[PDB]
Amino acid sequence: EPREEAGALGPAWDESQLRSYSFPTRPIPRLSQSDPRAEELIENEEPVVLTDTNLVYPALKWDLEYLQENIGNGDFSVYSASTHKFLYYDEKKMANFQNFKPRSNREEMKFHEFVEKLQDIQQRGGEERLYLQQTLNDTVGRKIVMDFLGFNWNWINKQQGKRGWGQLTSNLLLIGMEGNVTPAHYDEQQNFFAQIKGYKRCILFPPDQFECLYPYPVHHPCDRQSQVDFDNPDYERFPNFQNVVGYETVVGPGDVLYIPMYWWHHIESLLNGGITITVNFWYKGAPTPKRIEYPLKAHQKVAIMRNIEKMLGEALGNPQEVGPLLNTMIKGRYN
Amino acid sequence: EPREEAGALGPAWDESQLRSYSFPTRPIPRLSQSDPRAEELIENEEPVVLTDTNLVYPALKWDLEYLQENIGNGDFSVYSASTHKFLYYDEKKMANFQNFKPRSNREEMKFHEFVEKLQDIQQRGGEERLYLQQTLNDTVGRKIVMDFLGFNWNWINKQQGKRGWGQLTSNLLLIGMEGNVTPAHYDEQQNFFAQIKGYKRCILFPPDQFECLYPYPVHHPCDRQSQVDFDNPDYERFPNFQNVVGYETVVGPGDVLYIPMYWWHHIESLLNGGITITVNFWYKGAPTPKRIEYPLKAHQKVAIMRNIEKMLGEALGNPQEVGPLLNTMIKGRYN
Ligand SMILES: [O][C]C1=C([N+2](=O)=O)[C]=C(C2=NOC(C3=[C]N=C(C(=O)[N][C]C([O])=O)C([O])=[C]3)=[C]2)[C]=[C]1
Ligand SMILES: [O][C]C1=C([N+2](=O)=O)[C]=C(C2=NOC(C3=[C]N=C(C(=O)[N][C]C([O])=O)C([O])=[C]3)=[C]2)[C]=[C]1
Ligand SMILES: [Mn+2]
Ligand SMILES: [Mn+2]
C-alpha cells in the first residue's frame, strides 16, 4: 500500500522493490506522536511508526556529498558482505566455536574511501555490498555536531522519562546500499529507528515467536540472530518457521519506528531504491518491578533462557557442553 | 555364584530367588576392611562390600520376637504396597502434580501391630506387602539402645573423618518382607548399608548412567527415582535403558555395602528368603573443593541439572512450566 509523496511526485516505492518471503504480515500502525494510541503502543511494548516527531529533522538534508565534507576526517567502521545478507558476528565469542568462519568483514576507513568504494562497486557493476555504522559523538565535524544537537532531544528525553527507561546506551549513524539486508535478530534494548534517506522495509516479530525463529546458542558468535535463512527456510530443521507471522512497515525520511526490546526485526533497504541513511537510538530497559506479575511475559522468559545458557557454560567450563547437558536433562524426562 | 554358609549348612541362596531383568551386571568386590583395595574403592567413590566390619554385630541376633519385646511401645512408620514394588513419594511435592495418585501408604503403628499384620498376610496367603522404616534414637527400649551403642562406631567414625564426609544425617532400621523391591533411585548422601537378617540383592549403577535411567522431574513426588519399570521396560519412551549396565551383589548378615552418593541402587529382598533386616547409615557429602577440576564428574553434572530444574520452577512460578521452557530452549537450537 505505497504512500504517495507530496507534490504529485508519484508513489514512494513499488512492491517489486520488496523481497519475497514465505510468511504473512500485517501493518504496523503509522500515527502522530500526539495521538494517544501511539503512546499506548509504546507503553505496552508494541511497535509504532511515528510520522511527525521531527526527531532527526536537521539530518533530512544529509547525503553522501554533504556528509563527506562536514563529517571531517575520521575513521568510520565499514562492514562488507558478498551477499545481500550482512552477518554480524561477536568476535569475542569466536573462540568457543572454532569451526565458525565469518561471512562479513569490518574495515576502518575515512569517509571519502567509503564513498569511493561504494561508487567503485557501482562502476564495476559488482555484487560486493557495504555498510557503514558509526557513533554520533564529538569526533565528527562541527556542522554534523550542529545537526546532531538539533535533533528533537525534548521529545525523546520525555519518552525516556515517561517509560522509565534507562540511559541512552548508543547512537549509531547507519548508511547502506540498496538491497542490503540485516537478517532477523533481537536486541536487549529499547530502540527508536529514525529513517533519514531512502526507504527501509522493517519486519518485526513479537518475543513469543522465539520458538518459530530459532536463535543461535547464546555462546555462538551469531547470538541473538535467527538461524533460519529467510530466503531458503529449512522446514526440517526449523518446522515452526512455518507458523511465523510478522508486523511489517516501510519507513521513509521523517519516520521513526519504535522497536520494543526483545522484538525480532528484519530490516532491508529497498531494492533499486538508492542508498539509505538511518540513525538509531538505543536505551537501556526499565528495571524490572520488584512486584513480579506471575503470568510472566515472553521477553522475561527469553531473559531466563539466556541466563540459563550463560550459567551452564560457566559451570561446565566449556560452552560446547551446554547442548549435551540440556539434552541429557530433557530426553525422556520433559519431552 | 552363591556363597556357602559355614558349617556345611548349604548355599545361602539359589538363583531362582533372584528376579529376572533385561540388563547385564558384574559383581561388586567383597573385601576385608583391612584390605587397602577396599579403602581405595571408598576413596574413589565406588561401591564395595566389606565382610568383617562388625558394624552392626550386636544386632545380628535381632529378629521379630526379640525386637518386639525390647524395642518398647512406640509408633513405627509402616509402608504398604499392593505390588512387590514400593513407590515412595514426597508428599510435599504432591501439590505440583495434582494428577499423581500414590501407590504406597504409610501408617504409624506399634511393633506388635506390625508383626501381627505381617503374620496375618501370610496366614491369608495374601499379596499385600509391608515395609517398616524407623530411626534408631533414644525412644527405643533399653536393650535396643545397648545393641545400638555396641555398633562399631570406631570404624565408621574413622571412615567419616578420612573421607572428609559431613555429619551422620540419618540412621534407619529397615524391616521388610520377602520379595520386596525398592526400585532404582539415587540419594544425595553417602551410605553404608549394614545387612542384618536375610539376604538382599543390590544392583547399583554409576552416576553417568543418568541418561539410561530417566529420573522423574525434580518437582515430581517421585524425584530421584527411575521412571523405567524394570519388570516391563518401555524402550520407546526410554531407549537408552537398553544400554544400562549395573554392579550387582547379594548381601547377607554381617556384610556392609558402601553405596556412594548419587549412585543408583535397586534393592530387593530375596524371593522366599524370609524377612530382611537392614540398618542404613547416611552421611552428608564432603564439601566440594574450591579448586574445581574441570574434567568434571558425573555426580557434579547431576547436581547442576537438579539446580537448574529447581531454579527454573521458582523463576517461572509454576514447576509445570519447566518442561515447555526447556523444550523451547533446546528444539532447533541444541538438538
Ligand atoms: O550495551 C550497550 C550497547 C552498545 N554499546 O556498546 O554501546 C551497542 C549496542 C549495539 N551494537 O550494535 C547494535 C545494533 C543493533 N541493531 C542494529 C540493526 O538492527 N540495524 C538494522 C537497521 O537497518 O537499522 C544495528 O545496526 C546495530 C546495537 C547495543 C548495546
Ligand atoms: O537430609 C537428611 C536426610 C534425611 N533426614 O531427614 O534425616 C533422610 C534421608 C532419607 N530418607 O529416606 C532415605 C532412604 C533412602 N534410601 C533407602 C533405600 O534405598 N532402601 C532400600 C534398602 O533396602 O535399603 C531408604 O530405605 C531410605 C534417606 C536422607 C537425608
Ligand atoms: Mn537491531
Ligand atoms: Mn536409597
XYZ file of C-alpha atoms and ligand atoms in Angstrom:
732
model
C 0.000 0.000 0.000
C 2.644 2.525 -1.103
C 2.184 6.066 0.159
C 2.164 8.967 -2.297
C 4.877 11.594 -1.983
C 3.634 15.161 -1.689
C 3.543 17.355 -4.765
C 2.414 14.531 -7.079
C 5.941 13.068 -7.224
C 4.499 9.560 -7.615
C 4.487 6.526 -5.337
C 7.388 6.397 -2.906
C 8.055 2.732 -3.748
C 6.589 -0.201 -5.657
C 6.134 -3.770 -4.465
C 8.793 -5.117 -6.854
C 11.364 -3.456 -4.569
C 10.293 -5.726 -1.685
C 11.846 -9.177 -1.365
C 9.557 -12.220 -1.282
C 9.209 -14.353 1.857
C 7.146 -17.333 2.990
C 5.327 -15.803 5.957
C 2.329 -13.461 6.227
C 2.487 -9.998 7.771
C 0.180 -7.216 8.927
C 0.953 -3.484 9.062
C 2.494 -1.554 11.933
C 0.306 1.487 12.744
C 1.508 4.841 11.386
C 0.424 7.554 13.818
C 1.093 11.068 15.042
C 3.180 11.458 18.185
C 0.266 13.492 19.585
C -2.118 10.538 19.117
C -2.803 8.774 22.445
C -2.802 5.436 20.582
C 0.895 5.884 19.813
C 1.683 6.435 23.496
C -0.431 3.410 24.409
C 1.504 1.239 21.939
C 4.901 2.373 23.248
C 3.779 1.922 26.862
C 2.535 -1.597 26.026
C 5.852 -2.572 24.360
C 4.389 -2.746 20.847
C 5.831 -1.187 17.688
C 4.554 2.032 16.158
C 5.680 4.307 13.329
C 5.529 7.962 14.379
C 5.322 10.263 11.367
C 5.888 13.722 12.888
C 8.431 13.566 15.717
C 10.998 15.756 13.907
C 13.449 13.582 15.830
C 16.202 13.838 13.209
C 14.806 16.815 11.273
C 18.171 18.609 10.701
C 19.619 15.395 9.244
C 16.982 15.159 6.499
C 19.354 17.135 4.254
C 22.107 14.535 4.762
C 23.521 12.727 1.744
C 26.934 11.357 0.784
C 28.235 14.688 -0.544
C 27.124 16.726 2.480
C 28.371 14.096 4.931
C 31.771 13.732 3.260
C 32.521 17.455 3.555
C 31.275 18.111 7.071
C 31.797 14.830 8.921
C 35.534 15.558 8.885
C 38.481 13.200 8.545
C 37.929 10.347 10.976
C 37.905 6.569 10.897
C 34.464 5.068 10.236
C 33.797 1.344 10.590
C 32.656 -0.156 7.273
C 31.262 -3.699 7.076
C 31.379 -5.748 3.869
C 29.387 -8.725 2.623
C 29.437 -10.688 -0.628
C 25.702 -11.457 -0.463
C 22.863 -9.070 0.380
C 22.690 -10.608 3.879
C 25.035 -8.934 6.374
C 26.143 -11.428 9.010
C 27.326 -9.726 12.190
C 29.429 -11.885 14.488
C 30.693 -11.249 18.008
C 34.469 -11.605 17.708
C 34.781 -12.306 21.444
C 32.662 -15.448 21.088
C 34.623 -16.777 18.086
C 36.925 -18.662 20.472
C 34.151 -21.012 21.636
C 33.191 -22.032 18.074
C 36.473 -22.668 16.262
C 34.646 -24.038 13.209
C 32.880 -20.697 12.694
C 34.016 -18.861 9.563
C 32.972 -15.187 9.371
C 30.938 -14.056 6.363
C 31.313 -10.302 6.991
C 34.449 -8.195 7.344
C 34.927 -4.856 9.089
C 37.464 -2.314 7.825
C 38.143 1.102 9.344
C 38.484 3.841 6.728
C 37.802 7.517 6.122
C 34.506 8.764 4.728
C 35.963 9.566 1.304
C 37.244 5.993 0.992
C 33.770 4.687 1.832
C 32.144 6.931 -0.791
C 34.694 5.966 -3.451
C 34.456 2.265 -2.580
C 30.665 2.462 -2.866
C 30.846 4.254 -6.230
C 33.545 1.810 -7.390
C 31.207 -1.140 -6.810
C 28.528 0.545 -8.922
C 31.078 1.477 -11.607
C 32.207 -2.160 -11.804
C 28.589 -3.319 -11.569
C 29.768 -5.652 -8.818
C 27.940 -7.617 -6.142
C 30.069 -6.537 -3.175
C 27.826 -4.821 -0.620
C 28.912 -2.364 2.076
C 27.540 -0.944 5.317
C 28.776 1.993 7.422
C 27.976 2.066 11.158
C 29.452 4.831 13.315
C 28.603 6.558 16.594
C 27.463 10.198 16.685
C 29.967 11.767 19.092
C 32.186 14.864 19.318
C 34.772 13.376 16.920
C 32.567 14.360 13.949
C 32.773 17.740 12.246
C 31.260 20.929 13.579
C 28.367 21.064 11.101
C 27.360 17.482 11.906
C 27.518 18.442 15.593
C 25.094 21.316 14.960
C 22.711 18.957 13.141
C 23.070 16.367 15.915
C 22.288 18.962 18.601
C 19.243 19.901 16.511
C 17.600 16.518 16.997
C 14.339 16.592 18.950
C 16.023 15.823 22.254
C 12.997 17.231 24.084
C 10.661 14.617 22.586
C 12.975 11.636 23.045
C 14.100 12.625 26.557
C 10.446 12.819 27.623
C 9.891 9.366 26.109
C 12.836 8.086 28.152
C 11.409 9.565 31.357
C 7.788 8.507 30.836
C 8.585 4.872 30.053
C 11.056 4.634 32.940
C 13.814 3.550 30.567
C 17.467 3.699 31.465
C 20.214 5.692 29.836
C 20.841 6.349 26.147
C 23.250 3.484 25.539
C 24.186 4.021 21.884
C 23.512 6.296 18.916
C 24.521 4.865 15.539
C 24.603 6.524 12.136
C 23.707 3.871 9.575
C 24.472 4.177 5.833
C 23.816 1.272 3.479
C 23.474 0.225 -0.143
C 20.233 -0.641 -1.905
C 19.209 -4.257 -1.368
C 21.150 -4.607 1.896
C 19.533 -6.909 4.449
C 20.139 -7.104 8.179
C 18.712 -10.575 8.974
C 16.224 -11.239 11.747
C 17.594 -10.672 15.241
C 16.604 -9.135 18.559
C 18.320 -6.608 20.818
C 18.127 -6.333 24.595
C 17.469 -2.568 24.459
C 14.631 -0.235 23.536
C 15.155 1.309 20.098
C 13.925 4.340 18.185
C 14.754 3.886 14.496
C 14.878 7.276 12.768
C 14.801 6.996 8.979
C 16.662 9.750 7.136
C 17.357 8.902 3.482
C 15.662 6.281 1.336
C 13.206 3.605 2.386
C 13.678 0.554 4.593
C 11.242 -2.331 4.989
C 11.096 -3.395 8.646
C 9.582 -6.795 9.543
C 9.088 -7.327 13.279
C 8.121 -10.411 15.282
C 6.892 -10.398 18.914
C 9.076 -12.031 21.587
C 6.677 -15.030 21.802
C 7.839 -16.081 18.307
C 11.107 -17.321 19.862
C 10.070 -20.913 19.031
C 9.480 -20.078 15.355
C 12.750 -18.171 14.830
C 15.404 -20.475 16.331
C 18.130 -18.139 17.647
C 21.692 -19.376 17.778
C 23.154 -20.654 21.050
C 23.946 -17.785 23.404
C 27.675 -18.572 23.214
C 27.679 -18.651 19.398
C 29.146 -15.587 17.638
C 25.739 -15.062 15.982
C 23.969 -14.915 19.367
C 20.541 -13.179 19.139
C 20.231 -13.835 15.382
C 17.743 -16.240 13.817
C 19.251 -19.399 12.327
C 16.558 -19.516 9.629
C 17.578 -18.380 6.148
C 14.549 -16.263 5.232
C 15.361 -16.773 1.529
C 15.532 -20.592 1.811
C 13.903 -21.805 5.032
C 14.842 -25.309 6.175
C 11.485 -26.547 7.436
C 13.040 -29.848 8.524
C 15.472 -28.158 10.908
C 13.058 -25.310 11.715
C 9.475 -26.615 11.463
C 7.873 -23.787 13.435
C 9.114 -21.165 10.981
C 6.017 -22.279 9.038
C 3.952 -20.612 11.794
C 5.701 -17.237 11.979
C 3.650 -14.051 11.499
C 5.227 -10.601 11.420
C 4.425 -6.900 11.604
C 5.614 -5.043 8.516
C 6.111 -1.420 7.563
C 8.127 0.658 5.116
C 9.794 3.656 6.766
C 10.930 6.714 4.834
C 12.550 10.067 5.650
C 10.985 11.637 8.724
C 9.521 8.399 10.101
C 10.527 6.966 13.467
C 9.908 3.294 14.281
C 9.803 2.197 17.896
C 11.292 -1.305 18.023
C 10.482 -2.620 21.539
C 13.208 -4.540 23.326
C 13.414 -8.286 22.593
C 11.267 -7.830 19.472
C 12.718 -9.588 16.438
C 13.415 -7.299 13.490
C 14.435 -7.939 9.882
C 15.442 -4.742 8.043
C 16.094 -4.385 4.323
C 16.948 -1.419 2.114
C 14.530 -1.333 -0.796
C 15.877 -2.854 -3.999
C 16.882 -0.250 -6.598
C 15.995 2.472 -4.084
C 19.396 4.121 -3.653
C 21.495 4.461 -0.531
C 19.746 4.516 2.847
C 20.583 6.542 5.946
C 19.221 5.861 9.430
C 20.086 6.977 12.949
C 19.278 4.541 15.756
C 18.718 5.445 19.407
C 19.109 2.618 21.938
C 18.086 2.932 25.588
C 18.634 0.522 28.450
C 15.390 -1.089 29.552
C 13.466 -0.047 32.627
C 14.330 -2.060 35.757
C 12.015 -4.964 36.464
C 9.362 -4.153 39.093
C 10.047 -5.917 42.376
C 6.356 -6.958 42.401
C 6.542 -9.748 39.825
C 3.290 -10.459 37.970
C 3.270 -14.250 37.577
C 1.527 -14.517 34.172
C 5.086 -13.665 33.028
C 5.929 -12.044 29.689
C 7.680 -13.641 26.732
C 10.670 -11.300 26.972
C 11.173 -12.323 30.609
C 11.134 -15.989 29.570
C 13.759 -15.117 26.947
C 15.917 -13.491 29.625
C 15.589 -16.608 31.795
C 16.666 -18.846 28.908
C 19.688 -16.651 28.144
C 20.754 -16.698 31.804
C 20.489 -20.497 31.989
C 22.632 -20.911 28.861
C 25.242 -18.481 30.230
C 25.349 -20.046 33.696
C 25.533 -23.554 32.253
C 28.528 -22.633 30.097
C 30.397 -21.206 33.081
C 29.552 -24.146 35.347
C 30.653 -26.807 32.853
C 33.804 -24.863 31.945
C 33.093 -25.212 28.219
C 30.123 -23.682 26.370
C 30.189 -26.573 23.884
C 28.921 -28.934 26.608
C 25.751 -26.851 27.086
C 23.887 -28.727 24.355
C 24.673 -32.271 25.504
C 23.783 -31.443 29.119
C 20.499 -29.794 28.145
C 19.594 -32.845 26.030
C 20.540 -35.103 28.965
C 18.188 -33.081 31.173
C 15.220 -33.266 28.778
C 15.257 -36.568 26.870
C 12.716 -38.983 28.313
C 12.039 -36.602 31.220
C 10.443 -33.434 29.843
C 9.966 -34.211 26.135
C 27.816 -67.555 42.479
C 26.128 -68.274 45.828
C 28.412 -68.372 48.848
C 28.370 -71.389 51.160
C 27.326 -70.864 54.765
C 29.795 -72.115 57.352
C 29.257 -75.497 58.950
C 28.027 -77.130 55.722
C 24.583 -75.508 56.064
C 24.243 -75.366 52.269
C 24.177 -72.479 49.808
C 22.936 -69.216 51.276
C 20.636 -68.634 48.283
C 19.823 -70.005 44.840
C 19.406 -68.083 41.599
C 15.656 -68.794 41.428
C 15.282 -66.307 44.302
C 16.634 -63.506 42.078
C 14.246 -61.634 39.795
C 14.980 -61.528 36.060
C 15.921 -58.273 34.316
C 16.987 -57.177 30.840
C 20.401 -55.696 31.618
C 23.807 -57.266 32.307
C 25.697 -56.862 35.572
C 29.127 -57.524 37.054
C 29.968 -58.206 40.710
C 30.794 -55.667 43.396
C 34.065 -56.663 45.129
C 33.726 -58.389 48.512
C 36.744 -57.449 50.622
C 38.094 -57.149 54.142
C 38.031 -53.716 55.753
C 41.782 -54.171 56.316
C 42.368 -54.612 52.562
C 43.807 -51.424 51.005
C 41.687 -52.087 47.893
C 38.533 -51.510 49.937
C 39.824 -48.135 51.136
C 40.810 -47.239 47.576
C 37.296 -48.052 46.335
C 35.607 -45.960 49.038
C 38.021 -43.068 48.458
C 37.310 -43.240 44.704
C 33.510 -43.178 45.235
C 32.981 -46.766 44.069
C 30.937 -49.462 45.816
C 32.454 -52.227 47.909
C 31.086 -54.960 50.169
C 33.066 -55.163 53.413
C 32.691 -58.563 55.058
C 34.241 -58.025 58.508
C 33.462 -54.538 59.822
C 31.382 -55.809 62.774
C 29.499 -52.562 62.184
C 26.166 -53.912 63.445
C 27.499 -57.009 65.232
C 25.207 -56.776 68.325
C 22.164 -56.575 66.034
C 22.910 -59.910 64.339
C 20.702 -61.574 66.972
C 17.758 -59.335 66.015
C 14.541 -60.932 64.798
C 10.845 -60.097 65.093
C 10.432 -61.752 68.505
C 13.494 -60.105 70.065
C 12.652 -56.712 68.563
C 9.011 -56.802 69.669
C 9.942 -57.349 73.322
C 12.824 -54.915 73.650
C 12.039 -52.132 71.180
C 9.300 -50.977 73.558
C 5.895 -49.481 72.825
C 6.401 -46.716 70.287
C 4.968 -45.689 66.944
C 6.856 -47.121 63.958
C 6.161 -45.969 60.404
C 4.969 -48.876 58.240
C 4.667 -48.535 54.455
C 2.312 -50.714 52.405
C 2.212 -51.686 48.740
C -0.079 -53.953 46.731
C 2.705 -54.983 44.330
C 6.268 -56.003 45.187
C 7.459 -52.539 44.082
C 7.370 -49.955 46.883
C 6.776 -46.491 45.452
C 7.946 -43.748 47.800
C 6.523 -40.307 47.097
C 7.388 -36.922 48.577
C 4.088 -35.667 49.995
C 5.316 -32.059 49.875
C 5.671 -32.246 46.090
C 2.203 -33.764 45.551
C 0.763 -30.251 45.190
C 2.648 -29.579 41.939
C 1.376 -32.774 40.260
C -2.338 -32.952 41.058
C -2.808 -35.922 38.715
C -0.381 -38.015 40.783
C -2.063 -40.881 42.632
C 0.061 -42.516 45.361
C 0.714 -46.255 45.125
C 2.112 -46.660 48.661
C 0.552 -45.791 52.010
C 2.233 -45.053 55.334
C 0.563 -45.958 58.634
C 2.006 -45.366 62.098
C 1.540 -48.342 64.421
C 3.182 -50.205 67.280
C 5.642 -53.032 66.710
C 3.179 -55.733 67.772
C 0.668 -54.482 65.197
C 3.355 -54.663 62.508
C 4.276 -58.236 63.479
C 0.632 -59.339 63.566
C -0.158 -57.579 60.282
C 2.821 -59.309 58.661
C 1.780 -62.725 60.006
C -1.840 -62.019 59.005
C -0.800 -61.522 55.373
C 0.995 -64.877 55.410
C -1.951 -66.557 57.165
C -4.310 -65.243 54.473
C -1.736 -66.052 51.789
C -2.273 -62.508 50.545
C -0.296 -60.263 48.216
C -0.216 -57.171 50.438
C 3.415 -56.265 51.143
C 4.721 -54.206 54.065
C 7.863 -52.283 54.979
C 8.953 -50.828 58.337
C 11.362 -47.862 58.381
C 12.220 -46.220 61.704
C 15.075 -44.158 63.136
C 17.395 -45.569 65.816
C 17.097 -42.973 68.590
C 16.584 -42.849 72.371
C 12.836 -43.555 72.040
C 13.589 -47.282 71.599
C 13.896 -49.692 74.508
C 16.925 -50.020 76.735
C 18.139 -53.323 75.272
C 17.980 -51.944 71.727
C 19.931 -48.922 72.993
C 22.656 -51.228 74.332
C 22.835 -53.031 70.975
C 22.869 -49.698 69.125
C 25.720 -48.387 71.296
C 27.538 -51.641 70.507
C 27.815 -50.839 66.811
C 31.366 -50.364 65.541
C 31.268 -46.601 65.960
C 35.073 -46.537 65.961
C 35.268 -47.966 62.432
C 32.511 -45.822 60.930
C 33.616 -42.601 62.655
C 37.115 -43.088 61.223
C 35.560 -43.619 57.785
C 33.671 -40.343 58.223
C 36.862 -38.491 59.161
C 39.126 -39.996 56.494
C 36.761 -39.323 53.594
C 36.036 -35.787 54.807
C 32.314 -36.525 54.915
C 29.859 -34.410 56.833
C 27.645 -35.398 59.712
C 25.670 -38.600 60.236
C 22.382 -37.394 58.780
C 20.130 -40.417 59.345
C 20.140 -43.946 60.753
C 17.221 -46.120 59.646
C 16.191 -49.569 60.823
C 14.723 -51.382 57.831
C 12.481 -54.477 58.104
C 10.821 -55.944 55.021
C 9.016 -58.952 53.600
C 10.469 -61.464 51.162
C 10.185 -60.317 47.554
C 10.019 -56.616 48.457
C 11.643 -54.302 45.919
C 12.821 -50.736 46.381
C 13.035 -49.557 42.737
C 16.072 -47.854 41.254
C 16.815 -44.433 42.721
C 19.730 -42.334 43.925
C 20.353 -40.443 47.159
C 22.371 -37.273 47.667
C 24.246 -38.740 50.660
C 26.965 -41.298 51.304
C 25.521 -44.578 52.583
C 26.751 -47.609 54.496
C 24.198 -50.410 54.135
C 24.564 -52.877 57.014
C 22.756 -56.157 56.375
C 21.436 -57.886 59.491
C 18.859 -60.593 58.725
C 18.236 -62.350 55.427
C 19.692 -61.563 52.028
C 19.199 -58.552 49.771
C 20.255 -58.272 46.135
C 21.677 -54.799 45.475
C 22.035 -53.581 41.863
C 23.973 -50.325 41.516
C 24.525 -48.023 38.541
C 27.208 -45.291 38.322
C 26.090 -41.643 38.154
C 26.990 -41.476 34.418
C 24.036 -43.807 33.706
C 21.676 -40.852 34.284
C 20.775 -40.922 30.562
C 19.848 -44.621 30.676
C 17.697 -44.416 33.828
C 15.406 -41.427 33.179
C 14.708 -39.931 36.628
C 11.451 -38.119 37.212
C 11.325 -34.319 37.076
C 12.861 -32.791 40.191
C 9.489 -31.330 41.218
C 7.678 -34.664 40.791
C 6.830 -36.558 44.005
C 8.986 -39.446 42.723
C 12.037 -37.173 42.346
C 15.329 -39.166 42.255
C 13.582 -42.395 41.180
C 13.945 -44.001 37.757
C 10.859 -43.823 35.541
C 11.717 -47.171 33.929
C 9.704 -50.184 35.076
C 12.497 -52.745 35.442
C 9.931 -55.549 35.022
C 8.494 -54.119 31.768
C 10.846 -51.541 30.245
C 9.313 -49.159 27.707
C 12.128 -48.945 25.173
C 10.152 -46.439 23.096
C 9.946 -43.926 25.940
C 13.324 -44.952 27.397
C 15.590 -46.135 24.555
C 18.852 -45.827 26.483
C 17.696 -48.289 29.137
C 18.856 -50.833 26.531
C 22.421 -49.669 27.295
C 22.369 -49.838 31.097
C 24.983 -51.961 32.899
C 24.975 -52.449 36.662
C 27.090 -53.670 39.562
C 25.393 -56.484 41.459
C 25.909 -58.196 44.788
C 23.931 -60.202 47.325
C 24.486 -59.003 50.896
C 23.822 -61.171 53.933
C 24.159 -60.828 57.715
C 27.434 -59.168 58.656
C 28.036 -57.559 55.255
C 28.261 -53.801 54.779
C 27.761 -52.242 51.337
C 29.118 -48.780 50.663
C 26.672 -47.086 48.287
C 28.466 -43.911 47.084
C 26.394 -40.757 46.833
C 24.484 -40.228 43.565
C 24.922 -43.912 42.672
C 21.687 -45.524 41.515
C 20.613 -48.526 43.576
C 17.874 -51.131 43.150
C 17.408 -53.307 46.258
C 15.286 -56.440 46.526
C 14.683 -58.930 49.325
C 15.298 -62.422 48.001
C 12.156 -64.291 46.988
C 11.115 -66.962 49.503
C 14.018 -65.879 51.721
C 12.110 -64.708 54.797
C 12.009 -61.274 56.368
C 15.005 -58.974 55.920
C 16.537 -56.527 58.384
C 18.997 -53.773 57.478
C 20.362 -50.678 59.194
C 21.404 -47.799 56.939
C 23.892 -45.061 57.817
C 23.699 -41.861 55.749
C 26.338 -39.124 55.893
C 26.329 -35.696 54.298
C 28.839 -35.471 51.472
C 32.205 -33.791 51.782
C 32.216 -30.125 50.708
C 33.314 -29.520 47.141
C 36.969 -28.438 46.866
C 37.288 -24.778 45.943
C 39.869 -25.834 43.309
C 37.474 -27.214 40.698
C 38.950 -29.857 38.383
C 37.363 -29.101 35.002
C 37.073 -32.672 33.635
C 34.007 -32.594 35.934
C 32.383 -35.690 37.438
C 29.003 -37.168 36.571
C 27.595 -36.522 40.047
C 28.503 -32.834 39.723
C 26.677 -32.691 36.382
C 23.677 -34.270 38.125
C 23.804 -31.581 40.814
C 23.910 -28.883 38.123
C 20.864 -30.365 36.384
C 18.908 -30.547 39.651
C 19.741 -26.914 40.450
C 18.616 -25.739 37.002
C 15.286 -27.567 37.342
C 14.741 -26.095 40.824
C 15.684 -22.549 39.824
C 13.551 -22.723 36.687
C 10.490 -23.767 38.690
C 10.917 -20.858 41.097
C 11.548 -18.322 38.330
C 8.507 -19.326 36.267
C 6.286 -19.512 39.360
C 4.990 -22.954 38.371
C 7.082 -26.142 38.160
C 4.788 -27.459 35.412
C 6.189 -24.846 33.001
C 9.733 -26.223 33.402
C 9.252 -28.775 30.625
C 7.830 -26.434 27.982
C 10.537 -23.828 28.636
C 13.334 -26.398 28.465
C 11.931 -27.705 25.161
C 11.694 -24.108 23.890
C 15.366 -23.638 24.781
C 16.560 -26.803 23.010
C 14.404 -27.502 19.943
C 16.208 -26.478 16.770
C 18.998 -24.871 18.823
C 20.823 -27.607 20.737
C 19.187 -30.821 19.483
O 25.098 -2.185 25.898
C 25.359 -1.021 25.161
C 25.151 -1.338 23.684
C 26.114 -0.965 22.757
N 27.311 -0.266 23.186
O 28.275 -0.876 23.471
O 27.314 0.908 23.244
C 25.933 -1.252 21.416
C 24.785 -1.909 21.006
C 24.616 -2.220 19.670
N 25.574 -2.684 18.888
O 25.065 -2.906 17.651
C 23.762 -2.585 17.657
C 22.900 -2.680 16.579
C 21.681 -3.333 16.706
N 20.853 -3.420 15.678
C 21.165 -2.901 14.503
C 20.150 -3.070 13.374
O 19.166 -3.708 13.551
N 20.385 -2.471 12.077
C 19.402 -2.673 11.041
C 18.927 -1.302 10.601
O 18.668 -1.105 9.391
O 18.796 -0.386 11.460
C 22.381 -2.244 14.297
O 22.749 -1.684 13.070
C 23.258 -2.132 15.361
C 23.447 -2.147 18.933
C 23.828 -2.296 21.930
C 24.009 -2.004 23.273
O 18.944 -34.728 54.687
C 18.828 -35.619 55.763
C 18.187 -36.904 55.249
C 17.123 -37.467 55.938
N 16.626 -36.846 57.151
O 15.757 -36.056 57.090
O 17.090 -37.138 58.191
C 16.536 -38.632 55.475
C 17.019 -39.231 54.324
C 16.416 -40.378 53.846
N 15.110 -40.571 53.810
O 14.858 -41.785 53.261
C 16.026 -42.362 52.937
C 16.179 -43.606 52.351
C 16.971 -43.760 51.220
N 17.123 -44.949 50.661
C 16.520 -46.018 51.152
C 16.744 -47.341 50.424
O 17.376 -47.368 49.421
N 16.176 -48.570 50.939
C 16.405 -49.791 50.205
C 17.095 -50.757 51.149
O 16.812 -51.976 51.088
O 17.943 -50.319 51.975
C 15.695 -45.935 52.277
O 15.039 -47.041 52.826
C 15.530 -44.703 52.885
C 17.037 -41.485 53.296
C 18.072 -38.662 53.624
C 18.662 -37.499 54.091
Mn 18.807 -4.365 15.805
Mn 18.467 -45.327 48.888
